[PDB]
Amino acid sequence: HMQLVSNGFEVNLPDQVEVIVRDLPDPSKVKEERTRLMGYWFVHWFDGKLFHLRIKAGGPNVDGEHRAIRTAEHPWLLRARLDDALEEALPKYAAVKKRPFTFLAQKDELIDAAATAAGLSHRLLNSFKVIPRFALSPKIYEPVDGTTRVGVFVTIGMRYDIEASLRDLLEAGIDLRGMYVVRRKRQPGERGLLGRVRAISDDMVQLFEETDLASVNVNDAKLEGSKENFTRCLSALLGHNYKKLLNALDDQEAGYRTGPRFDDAVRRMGEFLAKKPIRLADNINAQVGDRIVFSNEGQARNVRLAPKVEYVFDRTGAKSAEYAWRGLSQFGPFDRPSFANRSPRILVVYPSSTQGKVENFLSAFRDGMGSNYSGFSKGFVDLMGLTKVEFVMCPVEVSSADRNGAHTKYNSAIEDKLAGAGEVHAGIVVLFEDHARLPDDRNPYIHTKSLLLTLGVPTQQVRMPTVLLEPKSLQYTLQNFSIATYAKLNGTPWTVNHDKAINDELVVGMGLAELSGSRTEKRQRFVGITTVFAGDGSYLLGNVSKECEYEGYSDAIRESMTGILRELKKRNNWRPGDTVRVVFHAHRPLKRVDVASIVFECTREIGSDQNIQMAFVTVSHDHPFVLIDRSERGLEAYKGSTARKGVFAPPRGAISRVGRLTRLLAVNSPQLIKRANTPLPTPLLVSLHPDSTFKDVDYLAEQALKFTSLSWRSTLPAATPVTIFYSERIAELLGRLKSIPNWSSANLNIKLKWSRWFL
RNA sequence: UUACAACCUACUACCUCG
DNA sequence: CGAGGTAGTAGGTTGTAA
Ligand SMILES: [Mg+2]
């Protein structure tokens, strides 16, 4: 876009500050000196050295060497001092966090405002609070390459908090049983979470899944400020008015979170922070400047709009579209000419009592909903170019009220049905809502997923509330169910475009899952790996991981890359002088040492005959940056609407430069924004590891964008590139399956090698 | 567990450097 | 093993399907 406005302001800083520097090779002394010199000096440890900035005349003295520190060369000093000085600039706002300074609005409280707007009241409602929370993050950025500056970035959220005495909630007739409670006050490094409520007898809450002690005094504990606890309290207290409160609260928040309202709030924060000089030290001021923009003015080259992603439906490119569903329904799937299994046999496993409902869903899915539900008129068979689909019906004698034996019944019925039947190529498993979230030792989702994956049969499962959706929602659910089921059968629904530049490119991602059976039990880490290859004008999904242990994960990345390089070379028969590029994706940066051994081992495997280029990229969701497109009017929220959605939301594929290694990428355009009250979106942050030998982060941001469009879980694009997302879905599944009796990964790389079984 | 999206809370980690 | 900058991951509730 021409000009993208950020949520940050320039901070005009002195061009240098004098400081006193002392060697301190042991960081553990810092906390003793910081305290010792409180109020008189700001101190900061960097690079084995203690840096001391005099904030005011007279107090303990410091020894060391005098140095002048030039802000252009070492912005880290004054960046850290700003964290404290912003706090000091706002003495009437109490820090609820430091670094970044985070604080509450003085008066605004939205429960009260929503209650008033809805016409509601209840004696305990003043004890439920939703309060705007602002943070001010000083960040280093580079308008133009080689030149640094510090800006202050403004972000807004809401603190949800339930102040109510547990005694008063019990006495007003809310059932506290099972609610998570936290300490009212926390000490330094003390935990918040205490456990769940078993009972309140006497002056004390009895807890289970406790973290430390098994009981705690009513007055030391509060319900955690979760949506679960708000809904459970307020629905009980307000009954059939609860809906009115909710819709009105949604309106209040929109007043802080939509584009023009966010923009206006950042404006007002800036004007407040600007009104005075912000003082860094006794005789040293900083000054909050203009809003930071991302533009191509005056030899800055800080923004671009990537072209639209093309959804690709053949090996050439004749058949492309801007949207997955419109492409698919028009051309059929990318692999239609070669797809091997025109007559899939699909086992359908379901509670016997849901038979008529399951038959209706199956008819809709297979044969279509017809021409009044135009999102899913024609059905899976014609959609995908198949000859037919045979269902093998597997009813299970199981009740929704059965909490302990549901998994056993599903599995027995599967075994018994399969033993007679011939080959089945996939299954659909239909699940009761009350079974969906049972613990894994008795969960029918995971037990049936396990048994059928062991047998080499991918499944697409579904809950009964989904089976029963009204037809206008059901059409969109059948789109997504269809896309994943076809992919489960080895199909390639679509690919995404790329330009033929170098002689081969491999992208590998890694994803984490952190699993436990409850919130009070320590999570265990598992990983997945997903690979994607450049093909002939479009990107192709490779093989995925079958092992999921987190320990050794850098070696597993290295092993995946070196094995695939070796096989890519044999296949493509690279010529002397060809260039091969390897890109890695994750939600965190790799270690420098691991980058070194990966590069070493990939370079040794490829050999001296080819050039290799390697990039290591972090994709970040939660950071302090927001992009505002003031040109964007937004769209009508539905047909004929004075309300707008995605007002000020940058276009999808907008790429802004933060610094040499970092870009912001806008993914959620007005079209994709859900409703009028949906907030201004945040972009993803794309960061290139400094040790990368391939350096074009613009190219890597556009590539990440394309990979969000490659998901076969949905017609709509994913939140993060499939290299990472598929890996998280694999890690979660494989880490759960680890503990399920009789699970074996043996078929994962045999019957299921081309099955997208993890979608 | 059709999904996409938003939010909230809780939990802690990750990388760097010495 | 700690300073320092940073933000990841899980699970719940509600609205909507480029
Ligand atoms: Mg799925």
Residue numbers in the entry: 19 to 777
The authors write:
Argonaute proteins belong to the PIWI protein superfamily, and contain a PIWI (P element-induced wimpy testis) domain, a MID (middle) domain, a PAZ (Piwi–Argonaute–Zwille) domain and an N-terminal domain. The Argonaute protein of R. sphaeroides lacks slicer activity and thus permits the formation of Argonaute complexes containing the guide strand and the uncleaved target strand. Our biochemical analysis shows that RsAgo specifically interacts with RNA and DNA as the guide and target strands, respectively, suggesting that RsAgo has a key role in a unique silencing system, that is, RNA-guided DNA silencing.
On the basis of the results of the nucleic acid recognition assay, we crystallized RsAgo complexed with a hybrid duplex containing a 5′P 18-base guide RNA strand and an 18-base complementary DNA target strand, and solved the structure at 2 Å resolution using the single-wavelength anomalous dispersion method with SeMet-labelled proteins. RsAgo was composed of N-terminal, PAZ, MID and PIWI domains, and L1 and L2 linkers. Surprisingly, the 3′-region of the guide RNA strand was base-paired with the 5′-region of the target DNA strand; this behaviour has not been reported previously for other Argonaute complexes. In the MID domain, the 5′-phosphate of the guide RNA strand forms hydrogen bonds with the side chains of Y463, K467, Q478, K506 and the main chains of Q479. The PAZ domain of RsAgo (R204, R209, G210, L211, E242 and G243) mainly interacted with the middle region (nucleotides 8, 9, 11 and 12) of the guide RNA strand in the heteroduplex.
